[PDB]
Amino acid sequence: MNLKVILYEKPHFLGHTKEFSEHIDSVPTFLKSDKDFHGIGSIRVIGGVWVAYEKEHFKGQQFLLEEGDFEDSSACGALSGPIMSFRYLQAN
Numbered sequence: 605m606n607l608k609v610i611l612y613e614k615p616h617f618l619g620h621t622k623e624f625s626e627h628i629d630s631v632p633t634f635l636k637s638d639k640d641f642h643g644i645g646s647i648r649v650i651g652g653v654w655v656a657y658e659k660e661h662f663k664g665q666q667f668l669l670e671e672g673d674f675e676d677s678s679a680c681g682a683l684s685g686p687i688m689s690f691r692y693l694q695a696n
Contacts, residue, residue: 607692608650609669613641615676615683617648625651628690630660644687647674653693656682662691 607626613619620641628634635642647656649671658664667682669690674680 607652610648611644612646614645656687657689660688
């Protein structure tokens with residue numbers, strides 16, 4: 605699988621970005637740099653099938669994110685609040 609997710613600071617793919625191609629157990633640890641942003645305004649899933657979670661370590665309410673462009677909460681319900689971890693999914 606080609607995995608890639610881009611997180612954007614602001615809705616509609618604006619502001620600074622973060623990129624990943626692996627499980628993110630902790631969004632806070634992932635965004636801990638002073639040159640980063642906090643809170644995710646929009647998401648592009650470039651490759652792979654992912655679960656976004658309310659809490660760290662893949663806990664709390666789950667949202668399914670497949671490949672697509674998610675400009676705001678109307679596009680993706682996950683964006684209507686904090687996302688604290690991401691896990692990619694894998695078939696055999």
